[PDB]
């Protein structure tokens, strides 16, 4: 029962790891589409958001 | 031990918050790339997906 | 108390589901922006990342 809660958290951690690989690959695609404009953040006029695990 | 499970859930919540900042900044980049076409959802011919915390 | 930890994990699972809908719609937008170049992965020269729930 406490083991079942721990297994759900491990599954959920593997899911977030998978999803973050999709997100960061999307970010690299946007960095390439915005190469001539100074990059994604410079074009939005925003501070860049980075992912911390 | 129950405290260790609670700490893992708090770490995991801080991670998802960080990742969602990257995702929403990517969405704003796509909204700008698709400005002339009526926006990302109008160009996909989809209902827009929004993030609910 | 164990029920409160389980409720937090269910809320967190609903959040990740919501966020993944935003991420995959962003991926479909990038697939369309990169249609002429062979697709997002072919343009990055990367193996494609996919999301596994
Ligand atoms: Cl994304």
Give a brief outline of the structure.
Chains A, B, C: Residues 24-40 are annotated as: Immunosuppression. Three copies of one chain form a homotrimer. In chain A, 70% of the residues lie in helices and 0% in strands.
Folded structure, characterized:
The structure is a homotrimer of 53-residue chains. Chain A is mostly helical. Chain A has one domain (1-53): Helix Hairpins. In chain A, 70% of the residues lie in helices and 0% in strands. Chains in contact: A-B, A-C, B-C. At the A-B interface, helix 1 and helix 2 of A face helix 1 of B. The complex binds chloride ion (CL). Chloride ion is lined by residues 23, 26 of chain A. Chains A, B, C: Disulfide bonds join 41-48.
Can you list the ligands bound to this structure?
Answer: chloride ion
Helix content of chain A: 55-70%
Tally of domains of chain A: 1
Q: What is the helix/strand order of chain A?
A: HH
CATH architecture of chain A: Orthogonal Bundle
Fraction of residues in β-strands of chain A = under 5%
- Overall strand count of chain A: 0
Oligomeric state of shown chains: homotrimer
Largest interface: A-B, 27 and 21 residues
Number of helix segments of chain A?
2
Main β-sheet of chain A: number of strands, strand sense, barrel status? none
Using the coordinates shown, work out and report the CATH topology of chain A. Answer: Helix Hairpins
How many whole angstroms does the radius of gyration of chain A measure?
17 Å
Q: What structural class should be given to the helix and strand makeup of chain A?
A: mainly alpha
Which outline of chain A best applies? elongated
How far the N terminus sits from the C terminus of chain A, by CA atoms, comes to 27 Å
CATH first level of chain A: Mainly Alpha
């Amino acid at each position: 029962d406490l083991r079942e809660v721990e297994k759900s958290i491990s599954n959920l951690e593997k899911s977030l790891t998978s999803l973050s690989e999709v997100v960061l690959q999307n970010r690299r695609g946007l960095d390439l589409l915005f190469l001539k404009e100074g990059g994604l953040c410079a074009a939005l006029k925003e501070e860049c958001a980075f992912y911390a695990d």
